Amino acid sequence: GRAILTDRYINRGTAFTMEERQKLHILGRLPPVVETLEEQVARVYGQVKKYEKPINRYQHLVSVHSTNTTLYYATILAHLEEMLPIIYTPTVGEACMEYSHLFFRERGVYFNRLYKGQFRNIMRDAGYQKVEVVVITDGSRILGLGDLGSNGIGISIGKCSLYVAGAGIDPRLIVPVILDVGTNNERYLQDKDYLGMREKRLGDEEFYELLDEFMEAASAEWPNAVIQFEDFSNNHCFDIMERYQKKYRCFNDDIQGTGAVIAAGFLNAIKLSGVSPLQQRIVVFGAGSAAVGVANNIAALAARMYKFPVQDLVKTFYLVDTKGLVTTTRGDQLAAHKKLLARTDVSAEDSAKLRTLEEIVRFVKPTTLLGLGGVGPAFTEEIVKMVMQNTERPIIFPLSNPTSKAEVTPENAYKWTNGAAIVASGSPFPPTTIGGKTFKPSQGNNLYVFPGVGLGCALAQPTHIPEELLLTASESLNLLTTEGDLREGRLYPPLEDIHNISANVATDVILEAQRMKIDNNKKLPRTRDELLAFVKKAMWKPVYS
């Protein structure tokens, strides 16, 4: 009766036919209109699209997710490019920050020092079987802005939901986790309505004692699961991966997902440019560990796909930090992560005259500007025009988040080059029309890779996730950009086709794992065509069945 309607996994609302309503004794529990899923999606979309503020839209979608899980995921997939900034970055962050009450109904798991030694019992008592995907955060944030502490559960809830939408992970087999080790958000510490551990973030030693117990408890109770780290601060995110990458099935989408996605898009940017990889001169504006991680992912992918010597791919890279061009002759002690991309072919005297971007671009004569600075619009009209002198097709990638940090707008880049610029960003931007010719930047969204990595590790059951599976996923994404997409200036397959992309990415990840003999699921086909067809069938679909 009203039990079927109150289970969000099997509830169909108005899609129950008259004759079904009769058999199920729910005649009189619904208005009399009968709708198809398509009609219900158009109705939900209409409801959503009339709300004016993102957080209003998010709140409406949360109520649909609460009542009718199928209709929620069906709505997301029919309008994915539009719904992505509502259901995740950056609306999700505002929702956590100020509307954390929207997450109370959802299936969160909470850990803290008060449950030390009980992490396994908490996981057992959760009563979830054959869990495939666990997103964990501590709410510290990657961009080191707005520590959310316990409210970070909204980030895990949002990320888990993107595995279901993106790769058809079954929504009963995802678990969002908050590991609450305190917060340095001073408003929260004095806020009467903060529900987390009201204390400063624990020191490293107690932090790793709790996270170790979590990783070991998850491996015993959720043995089939992938553990994905989300939105951990820079002080911990890299060290977490060095500590766990080999003993557990885990990855970090911020670090590994981002580089895999940017690399796939950058190589397609190379294909459209005229200028082949060994002919590229690439300014990397910004030299944090993440920016150097992306450069290395690009080198590693170009080596995989084209067997150029990797040393030679590295020499295409000119790294800029806060001081200027990174060189061996400029006279400072370089961070370990910067030595690898330091120029060896630049005198001390030239180094001293290479400090502002304008003069770095004038000397290096780059073919590509990679924006990973997050210090505002450093790619000026004159800097872009200078790149026009060195290539017919400047590759300009303003990837710094959020959009106000970005090095340049797609619109300015397209304008300043008269449509010649090849552009990718993190954020969706509308098309620019230049003399009747339309241009639209490619969105290097992390949704392209983590879902397929998740679905691939769910099926394959690898003992771990070494860099080789992330590289395979990077190449798989590059190779799904068709000749037709490339012809239309797209650097990625279309976002709307995420199920197909995720099936392909998973297939490739599985074959890499099989090849490395780290797979534990022997039921799988070991040839691509059969595997791809099997993977597509294993995927949960947002349709009534």
Ligand X SMILES: COc1ccc(NS(=O)(=O)c2cccc(NC(=O)c3cc(F)cc(F)c3)c2)cc1
State which residue, 66 or 356, has the beta carbon closest to ligand X.
66
Number of H helices, E strands in the chain: 25, 13
Report residue 80 CA to chain centroid gap: 14
How far apart CA 225 and CA 216 sit, in angstroms, is 12
Question: Residues for the chain: how many in total?
Answer: 545
254 has binding-site annotation? yes
Which of 73, 88, 111, 232 touches a copy of itself (CB under 8 A)?
A: 111
How far apart CA 75 and CA 61 sit, in angstroms, is 9
Size of the site for ligand X (CB under 6 A): 21
Identity of the amino acid at 124: R
Which of 11, 91, 425, 502 touches ligand X (CB under 6 A)?
A: 11
Per CB under 6 A, 355 contacts ligand X: no
Three-state DSSP class for residue 371 = strand
- Map residues 85-124 to x or -, x wherever contact with ligand X holds by CB under 6 A: ----------------x--xx--x----------------
Q: Decide the pairing of beta strands 437-439 and 109-111.
A: unpaired
* Candidate segments 43-51, 314-322, 343-351, 446-454, binder of a copy of itself by CB under 8 A: 43-51
How far apart CA 88 and CA 178 sit, in angstroms, is 17
CB of 253 to ligand X, least distance (A): 24
Is 396 in contact with 387 (CB distance < 8 Å)?
yes
Per CB under 6 A, 40 contacts ligand X: yes
CB of 108 to ligand X, least distance (A): 5
Other C-beta atoms lying within 10 Å of the C-beta of residue 106: 17
Which of 4, 54, 90, 110 touches a copy of itself (CB under 8 A)?
A: 110
Identity of the amino acid at 177: V
253 has binding-site annotation? no
State which residue, 6 or 389, has the beta carbon closest to ligand X.
6
Q: What angle do CA 507, 509, 510 make, to 5 degrees?
A: 65
* Side-chain-facing half-sphere of 236: CA atoms under 13 Å: 23
Q: Classify residue 150 by its DSSP letter.
A: G
CB of 70 to ligand X, least distance (A): 9
- Map residues 47-66 to x or -, x wherever contact with ligand X holds by CB under 6 A: ----------------xx--
412 has binding-site annotation? no
State which residue, 47 or 224, has the beta carbon closest to a copy of itself.
47
State which residue, 98 or 358, has the beta carbon closest to ligand X.
98
Q: Write out the two tokens for 229.
A: 């780290």
DSSP 322-340: SSSB-BTTS-S---HHHHT
What burial class does residue 337 get, using C-beta atoms within 10 Å of its C-beta: 0-12 exposed, 13-18 middle, 19+ buried?
middle
Q: Which does 40 bind (CB under 5 to 8 A by kind): ligand X, a copy of itself, none?
A: ligand X
Q: Which does 311 bind (CB under 5 to 8 A by kind): ligand X, a copy of itself, none?
A: none
Positions marked active-site: 88, 159
Is 53 in contact with 19 (CB distance < 8 Å)?
no
Could you tell me the end-to-end alpha-carbon distance of the chain, in angstroms, rounded to an integer? 19
* Interface residues toward a copy of itself, by CB under 8 A: 1-2, 13-14, 25-33, 42-43, 46-47, 56, 59-60, 63, 66-67, 101-102, 104-105, 107-112, 114-115, 118, 121-123, 125-127, 150, 180, 192-197
Residue numbering of the annotated binding site: 141, 230-231, 254, 401, 445
* Interface residues toward ligand X, by CB under 6 A: 2, 5-6, 11, 13-14, 29-31, 40, 44, 63-64, 67-68, 71, 101, 104-105, 108, 195
Residue numbering of the annotated binding site for (S)-malate: 141, 401, 445
